[PDB]
Amino acid sequence: SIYPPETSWEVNKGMNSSRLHKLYSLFFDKSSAFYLGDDVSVLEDKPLTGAYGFQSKKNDQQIFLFRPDSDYVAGYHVDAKSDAGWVNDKLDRRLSEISEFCSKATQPATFILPFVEMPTDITKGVQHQVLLTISYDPKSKQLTPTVYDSIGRDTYSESLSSYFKGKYRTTCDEILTQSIEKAIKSTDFTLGKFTRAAYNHQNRLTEGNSGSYTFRTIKEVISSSAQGTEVKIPGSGYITSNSYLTSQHVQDIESCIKYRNLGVVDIESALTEGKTLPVQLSEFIVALEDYGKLRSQQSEKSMLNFIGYSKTAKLTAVELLIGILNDIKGKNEISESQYDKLVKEVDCLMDSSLGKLVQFHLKNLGAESLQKLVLPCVKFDDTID
Structure with missing residues (x-):
């Protein structure tokens, strides 16, 4: 369990x-x-x-x-x-x-x-x-x-x-x-x-x-x-x-x-054991999956009016983000091609409820934002650059 x-x-x-x-x-x-x-x-x-x-x-x-x-x-x-x-x-x-x-x-x-x-x-x-x-x-x-x-x-x-x-x-x-x-x-x-x-x-x-x-x-x-x-x-x-x-x-x-x-x-x-269980990365990845499934069920959170982000807008982002961290968790590089994609979704990932989820893990993963997190793992070799 x-x-x-x-x-x-x-x-x-x-x-x-x-x-x-x-x-x-x-x-x-x-x-x-x-x-x-x-x-x-x-x-x-x-x-x-x-x-x-x-x-x-x-x-x-x-x-x-x-x-x-x-x-x-x-x-x-x-x-x-x-x-x-x-x-x-x-x-x-x-x-x-x-x-x-x-x-x-x-x-x-x-x-x-x-x-x-x-x-x-x-x-x-x-x-x-x-x-x-x-x-x-x-x-x-x-x-x-x-x-x-x-x-x-x-x-x-x-x-x-x-x-x-x-x-x-x-x-x-x-x-x-x-x-x-x-x-x-x-x-x-x-x-x-x-x-x-x-x-x-x-x-x-x-x-x-x-x-x-x-x-x-x-x-x-x-x-x-x-x-x-x-x-x-x-x-x-x-x-x-x-x-x-x-x-x-x-x-x-x-x-x-x-x-x-x-x-x-x-x-x-x-x-x-009197110890503390430190937040690991898998927790982040499952917490994005369980946003993704819940949101896909039509979500009334800021739905009715002044919508800046649609459900397809968010889901496209959560999926790309996840895809990154799975690769990082298999201990892999990230093509700058994917760091490219990510920084375009990074405004979406920080919006409303998604934000404090991504906020929660980035403080607990030690990184100052998504880039400072994913960036040390990116690979530009050798072009372009």
């Missing part, structure tokens, strides 16, 4: 299982706002199945972060006459193996599991990302759950009354704390209080940022517990939610998903 470049995606279009795991690569990229590599270093055993173990440099507290399997889902019933919900039979599995990990646990730990949660009764889809934080102290024999919600605090222009919070549930805490209470039934841990952190003030029925926020909130909990800081989010030690999830936090997310291509092998190794 591979995570391809999705040239269309933007932070509004939603966050799923796979994409979330791609962003796991940014933790150890130093050029990205999500860098954890000062805070923690990977833990040698990975004792926890389906999770990434880390040692905190400052704290020497262990923190384990679950790779997204979605298939980690908690439905709730919004009608309060009915069941509290279900937890998906794997998310209950992992809850129990967390309990079982802490049976053996020498040093304090914090467990970071991203998941989705949904109303079952509502006919609408309404699929909404959150993040569950389970912290365990070996001296207390206590596990305190928390879950961090982007939709967050209720406006009191819209707020369920203490009567109707009896007839309706806004959220899944009921079913989830049964499952966590049920997971530790066996052992001698007392369960601390289940707390829900609501942040980002007011959001929708549900919205698609709620994942990109959740992924950020992964970064702040892993830093906070690594150092010994209390975890801060919007409304507590943060002001509005564009200082928390900043204009940079969004650039590296959207770019890693849009222009980037990764085997799942590589993010296992990037998280296991």
Whole structure:
């Protein structure tokens, strides 16, 4: 399995299982706002199945972060006459193996599991990302759950009354704390209080940022517990939610998903080996192919009016560009005949969405533009000249 470049995606279009795991690569990229590599270093055993173990440099507290399997889902019933919900039979599995990990646990730990949660009764889809934080102290024999919600605090222009919070549930805490209470039934841990952190003030029925926020909130909990800081989010030690999830936090997310291509092998190794996966050239070539296929399907991006570039105009360019870099990647020259063709298309390749794709790779291939990139490989020998 591979995570391809999705040239269309933007932070509004939603966050799923796979994409979330791609962003796991940014933790150890130093050029990205999500860098954890000062805070923690990977833990040698990975004792926890389906999770990434880390040692905190400052704290020497262990923190384990679950790779997204979605298939980690908690439905709730919004009608309060009915069941509290279900937890998906794997998310209950992992809850129990967390309990079982802490049976053996020498040093304090914090467990970071991203998941989705949904109303079952509502006919609408309404699929909404959150993040569950389970912290365990070996001296207390206590596990305190928390879950961090982007939709967050209720406006009191819209707020369920203490009567109707009896007839309706806004959220899944009921079913989830049964499952966590049920997971530790066996052992001698007392369960601390289940707390829900609501942040980002007011959001929708549900919205698609709620994942990109959740992924950020992964970064702040892993830093906070690594150092010994209390975890801060919007409304507590943060002001509005564009200082928390900043204009940079969004650039590296959207770019890693849009222009980037990764085997799942590589993010296992990037998280296991503490390293960073440097952008290679093949990624560029596939990200142009997946612009070429997507654009060929009639694209409404700047289509209607003031069109300077047609679809055939762009596609002719993406194909020629690609043709170059394949030759360069077979470690070949470029006839000046082809460098000729290219520099005529170079105004097209930098236009609108194509541009930031070509922009993304040229900064990450080190070259200042296409020429300074392709030029060192061109062959004029010996005419003309």
